[PDB]
């Protein structure tokens, strides 16, 4: 007796690691005999929620990436080019770069 | 069941074994009329197969996410690879690029 | 009792595999002496269909490439950068990608 | 409640765990997997602003790294050139034209 | 007993294979002694047909290239990056590709 | 006896080199007793000026960069590719390099 | 006695091959006492024709390059990556290419 | 004198890259450094930018001569010579440009 | 009488080879004392012509580059990737190029 969206979230969490749709479906608590078509219909209904959830899991891992990038930028034992790319990366994300393009339209 | 279930079974065989005729004969079809029916059948049902294979491509995204997270968190990986994976998840998380200034000239 | 279209499709498959205009022409089951002008005329007549066929042939190979990329992503003994590129590719084709650019016109 | 949220935000930014950073902010320790989800999706924009400010905090370090690489005589030539070009690009001196012909 | 179109076709074939202006000119069957001034006018006259012929000839080679790319994709003993690039290539030409970009115009007038 | 603008400039310069916000705050000459809260409010207030200062410092380092790029271009015992990239770069900043695109829009 | 058009073409050919303005100028036959005073202006006169001449000369080498690319693509003793790049190149020049891009415009 | 110290301060920044250091090296008041250099630099930003843009224009013949020498040097690596030749041909006014567009809509 | 239009071009040649503004100014036969400012002002006056002249000098070097590229393409002992890049460059210069792009502007305005 659980929220249908919460059992859907359990299905999503089980799908994110163990990589099988019907397996996560029955692990979400559905009919084990009416299994392989009902998981397909359920997935085809709530596709947009699944995409938003996957983007949420991507966003959950960003602080690790930030620590990695800063540590590489301040690492004295790294190659010069990799430090330069890390410093460039955080400077770009900080709001500094530029591009000047000149256009010339010779129409016919 | 419905001929559509035999078609999706045929699509499953096409997704794994890379042969039109082999996936045809695995569906339970004519072994004598082999080159004839699979070509017309495939040329008719293109959109369902394309949607099915794009769904199969999407089926592997948790694996790819786990791989990228592992490369970012693997302590013994090269500096450049850790930096590039971290840049990738930061970009997919919603932290990105920057400015461009335009200058428009026109034909005499 | 064979269709012109079917003969044409056999000629296209033979051109994709046996790599010669006159050779694939006669392998389609045609006249071997009235060939060198006739195969050229036949090719320039049905060019759009041959190109559509070749795109169908390219699409015939996408599951192999899909398996290749998934295998490269799942290989524990592969170089790090290549695994990363394979996973990036699967994430991009799955529908999660790149972002913004700001415009400012000085005219 | 926002100051306790900032406490939780720093704990999340450094220790990389939702439930642990939740209880490390001085919040309810028993019921974790449900309330942290609602709180996290609730203040998403605040967390994003928090992380973008933290990204901006490291900019002086990056600038110093790039100038050091540009001034190092024992650095490879290609890396020195890329760094000097990079600060020149960020300083406001750059590129040029592209001509179009539309039929 | 040949027309201007068939001698032009022989001229184009000789130019595609034997690579010489006077050589491809005379293999079409003209006078070899007073050649160097007239070939410039001839080529500048039928340039577009030669270009279309050359693109046709390029289109003649696609199955060889396709076979090479597929073999590289299925070759297990090839470097990982080249196998990856090849699989990416056939997927891109097959119709599975890229994605979004957001615009932000801070306008002037 | 110096402006809030001069105290802000010293705080920003200290922020350029001196990492601690609170360290750059007290080195700018403010109250050391309540610094860690007041530096947060002060920084969140004057964000645009600090960003402008950092862009000013980036421009402050450009003559060094020009000297390095021209010197690497003039180095007689340097690799060809690096000399080529530097010469290309200064030629591009001088106002050279062209690129043509023909468009065909099928709406 | 020489036709002016043929003489200009000969001067152009000398620039194309023997790499000198004054060399091709004296190779046309011109006033011996003065050349530099006029040759610079003369070159500035027929600039567009010389550009057409060099654009024709680049096209003169196209079948050789095509043979080069086909041989590199079909040579079995070449690196895998170079074989792939050559095959890709001839496939692109044959007319088979790239795909989509999504736009999202936020206003001001 | 004042102009001499103005451009010498910039060349000193080009040589050892520090504003207070180049200010005290330029030959003005050595006693007050951190405030007077800030005011002086903020005033003449356009002047230093124009000066360095002129200095860049001073070096373009060097870049051209270096590139031509790299292109015609017979014992240089092949790829570097090819990149140099491509660059000089591109700046001479010769490049490829094809592109077919197809703009759709959600209706 | 050397005209100001042609003497400027001689100064331009001196700037392209002998690499100094004031030195080329006095090497045109000017006052060596009227020095550091006068060459700067002269340069600021005729900037567009100086740029056009250096562009003619840059255009002067294209035949050598073409010779080099064809030589690299024709070298039997050159690396495969480098010969391929040379052939790609000359094919692009001949008029054979790029390919498709699909646009889709689905947004909430």
Author numbering:
A (entry chain G), G (entry chain C): 13 to 120
B (entry chain F): 14 to 121
C (entry chain E), F (entry chain I): 13 to 119
D (entry chain H): 16 to 118
E (entry chain D), I (entry chain B): 13 to 121
H (entry chain A): 15 to 121
How do the authors describe this structure?
The genome packaging motor of tailed bacteriophages and herpesviruses is a powerful nanomachine built by several copies of a large (TerL) and a small (TerS) terminase subunit. In contrast, TerS is a DNA recognition subunit that binds packaging initiation sites (referred to as pac or cos) in preparation for genome packaging. TerS also stimulates the ATPase activity of TerL, while repressing the large terminase nuclease activity. Thus, three related small terminase subunits from Pseudomonas phages PaP3, NV1 and LUZ24 are polymorphic in solution but adopt a nonameric quaternary structure in the high affinity heparin-binding conformation.
PaP3 TerS crystals diffracted to ∼3 Å resolution with one nonamer in the asymmetric unit (AU). An initial molecular replacement (MR) solution was gradually improved and entirely rebuilt, yielding a complete atomic model of PaP3 TerS currently refined to an Rwork/Rfree of 25.0/27.4%, at 3.0 Å resolution. PaP3 TerS folds into a hollow nonameric ring of mixed α/β structure that resembles a mushroom. The quaternary structure of TerS consists of an apical gear-like ring ∼105 Å in diameter sitting onto a 9-stranded β-barrel ∼50 Å in height, similar to that found in β-porins. Unlike P22, PaP3 TerS lacks a ‘dome-domain’ and is pronouncedly asymmetric. The RMSD between subunits varies between 1.23 Å for chains a-h, the most similar and 1.67 Å, for chains a-i, the most dissimilar. This asymmetry is generated by an uneven pattern of lateral contacts between neighboring protomers. Three pairs of contacting subunits (labeled as i:a) make a close-distance (e.g. 2.5–3.5 Å) salt bridge between R56 and D21 projecting from juxtaposed protomers. The crystal structures of PaP3 and NV1 TerSs presented in this paper revealed a solvent-filled channel of 9.7–15 Å diameter. This channel is too small to accommodate dsDNA, ruling out the viral genome threads through the central channel of TerS during packaging. We demonstrate PaP3 TerS binds DNA through a highly dynamic N-terminal helix-turn-helix (HTH)-motif that adopts a different conformation in solution versus in crystal. After electrophoretic separation, both free DNA and TerS:DNA complexes were visualized using the fluorescence signal of Cy3 and quantified, which revealed PaP3 TerS binds the cos sequence with significantly higher affinity than scrambled DNA. Mutations in the HTH helix α1 (DM-TerS) reduced binding to cos by over 70%, confirming this region of the protein is responsible for DNA-binding activity in vitro.
